[PDB]
């Protein structure tokens, strides 16, 4: 009643506060600040449940509705680009503050066990939370064409502006916020369409609510509204040459999620559109060149896990892995970025191209891999180097297994002596060399993160052995002794360019039963002994399945009213021991399967070597006896 009905006065005041930019931005900031709870950034949604109960209003929805209507329609009356950028940034921040304040796991567990197991008392609380929280309205607005059009217009800008702009420029911050909102929407679209739409529809059908739809029924998902924009990927790729770590990581994650989808790649390749869009003015070439220049940039030894360069490298590697693992038979953008001529159900190399001159992304990866040393002195056997090489080897294996990109890759590898570089980069493992300053025999080893690096190193050795065996089989079937001599010399322990290297029998040091990975010390467990891991269990024992059971048991014991305060610490320490027991069992299973895979790879390599061997046997009798001596204790 601002001094005329309230439904009219409120909209009149909102429209009055919409004229201009200063007052609009100030109101948006005020609303964003008010939406923050007093405890800071989970229940008790930050607003009174009786907000607007007197008048026939939907609560706090009108505010978000007006904000979205403004951001969608009145963005053309702003001449000053700075004001428009500030308004878009404020709207994106408001949307993010509204989305981040939504419970996902809570609603999932509710819809799962509340009505099916728990009573019907708390159901009303979750219902009111889902009905009053503005997340549903934001998601509904996200399916509008105006919103995505404004977003892609804001993200589509000239490169000169971003180049001459400052890292703290509002344009970069707005683009980052928009990418984050898009990521959150792509993550929560399924949860929404599953546990919001039906409940809201049922409530609207039962009770009396007057709401105006703002979503498009045709857009069954968020990808339907964005699959019509081809310049988005081009802009995301061009924005990688700016140097901004956060923006680069966001763009890489967005491209990875896009390549991971299915409808987008079904619409693109039902000839194709992306390959021709990225080959308009040589965008792929410059993108590959920028990626190569980036991965070649060194890292900061002190800021191992904080070096933005290493983070960008890992993001690019994850993107390539996800793009190659998805739909390997049909080519993708990864093949074009590597320097291949992506043709319909066929690949090829062009003359004088970047991949022909051995200057491309794949060759850059090969170089940075062969010029990488993991053997250190101060710590020795670092972890992040191991992770990097493991990712590189996974990408190489994904490229090799694909028969569409196997022959050319094997040719390019054998034409540069990659196996020789790998062997020269090999390092022997012993129980004395610690992992990141920590010894293996220590009990904390199974609890520390060194297990991941150990599994990665085992997988790397297995992949190297498999590649060596495949190359040996190829050279044998090709009936050419020009390379067989060098292969045997490398296996004999000599190199003629003589440089010596440890033989294959030297690397047979990963089979050791002294650690007793199978045996586990079982504590007394005077209580909770009957709690098994039935619902916990692909050997993967979930911890929540036992956490809920032990919590229910503790609640029952407390309700029994028999020395509940004293014996609580016993149950607490038993749970703290059981969680580490489960983690140790999982790590032991992982180590066991890794050792099994490595042993299988080594056995296959040895079989391929023994079978395809025309060299005399009397000289190799020494190696035969050595292998027999080495396997004797293993069999025993």
């Amino acid at each position: 009643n601002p001094f005329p009905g309230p439904q009219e006065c409120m909209e009149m005041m909102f429209r009055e506060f919409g004229t201009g930019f200063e007052q609009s931005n100030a109101f948006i900031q005020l609303l964003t600040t008010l939406l923050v709870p007093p405890e800071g950034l989970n229940d008790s949604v930050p607003f009174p449940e009786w907000l607007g109960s007197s008048i026939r209003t939907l609560g706090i929805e009108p505010y978000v509705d007006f904000v979205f209507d403004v951001f969608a329609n009145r963005t053309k009356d702003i001449s000053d680009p700075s004001q428009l950028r500030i308004l878009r940034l404020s709207c994106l921040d408001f949307v993010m503050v509204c989305l981040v304040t939504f419970n996902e796991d809570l609603i999932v567990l509710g819809h799962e066990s509340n009505i099916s197991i728990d009573d019907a008392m708390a159901a009303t609380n979750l219902a009111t939370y889902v009905r009053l929280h503005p997340f549903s309205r934001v998601m509904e607005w996200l399916f509008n064409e105006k919103v995505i059009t404004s977003l892609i217009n804001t993200i589509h800008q000239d490169p000169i502006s971003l180049g001459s702009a400052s890292p703290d420029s509002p344009l970069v911050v707005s683009i980052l916020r928009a990418i984050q909102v898009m990521i959150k929407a792509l993550e929560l679209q399924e949860t929404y369409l599953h546990l919001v739409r039906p409940e809201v529809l049922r409530y609207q059908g039962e009770a009396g609510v007057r709401r105006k739809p703002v979503a498009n029924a045709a857009y069954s998902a968020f990808e339907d509204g964005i699959l019509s924009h081809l310049s988005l990927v081009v802009d995301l790729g061009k924005y990688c040459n700016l140097g901004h770590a956060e923006l680069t990581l966001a763009c890489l994650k967005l491209l990875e999620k896009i390549s991971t989808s299915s409808r987008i790649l079904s619409a693109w390749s039902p000839r194709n559109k992306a390959i021709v869009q990225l080959e308009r003015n040589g965008e792929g070439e410059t993108i590959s060149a920028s990626l190569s220049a980036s991965i070649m940039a060194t890292l900061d030894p002190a800021l191992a896990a904080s070096g933005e360069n290493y983070r960008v490298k890992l993001a690019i590697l994850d993107f390539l892995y996800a793009c190659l693992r998805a739909t390997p038979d049909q080519p993708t953008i990864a093949h074009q970025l590597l320097g291949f001529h992506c043709e319909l159900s066929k690949l090829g190399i062009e003359p004088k191209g970047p991949f022909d001159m051995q200057k491309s992304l794949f060759h850059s990866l090969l170089n940075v891999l062969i010029t990488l040393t993991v053997s250190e002195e101060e710590q020795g056997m670092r972890g992040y180097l191991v992770t990097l090489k493991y990712r590189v080897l996974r990408i190489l294996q994904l490229l090799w297994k694909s028969p569409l990109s196997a022959s050319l890759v094997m040719d390019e590898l054998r034409a540069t002596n990659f196996l020789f570089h790998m062997l020269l980069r090999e390092v022997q493992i012993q129980p004395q060399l610690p992992w990141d300053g920590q010894l293996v025999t220590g009990c904390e080893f199974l609890l520390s993160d060194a297990s991941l690096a150990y599994i990665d190193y085992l997988a790397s050795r297995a992949a190297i052995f498999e590649y060596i065996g495949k190359e040996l089989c190829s050279v044998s079937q090709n009936r050419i002794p020009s390379i067989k001599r060098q292969i045997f010399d490398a296996l004999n322990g000599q190199i003629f360019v003589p440089l010596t290297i440890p033989s294959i029998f030297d690397f047979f040091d990963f089979i050791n039963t002294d650690y007793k990975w199978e045996e586990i010390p079982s504590p007394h467990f005077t209580y909770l002994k009957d709690l098994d891991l039935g619902p916990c269990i692909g050997v993967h024992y979930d911890i929540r399945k036992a956490q809920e059971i032990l919590a229910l048991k503790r609640k029952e014991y407390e309700h029994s009213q028999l020395a509940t305060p004293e014996f609580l610490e016993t149950v607490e320490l038993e749970e703290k021991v059981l969680i580490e027991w489960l983690t140790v069992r999982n790590r032991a299973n992982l180590l066991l399967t890794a050792r099994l895979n490595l042993l299988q790879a080594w056995a296959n390599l040895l079989l391929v070597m023994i079978e395809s061997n025309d060299f005399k046997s009397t000289p190799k009798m020494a190696f035969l006896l050595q292998a027999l001596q080495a396997i004797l204790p293993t069999l025993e």
Binding site: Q358, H421, I495, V497
Partner: peptide, 9 residues
């Protein structure tokens, strides 16, 4: 063609 890929330590 192989400026640095050579095995010349």
């Amino acid at each position: 063609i192989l400026p640095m890929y050579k095995l010349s330590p």
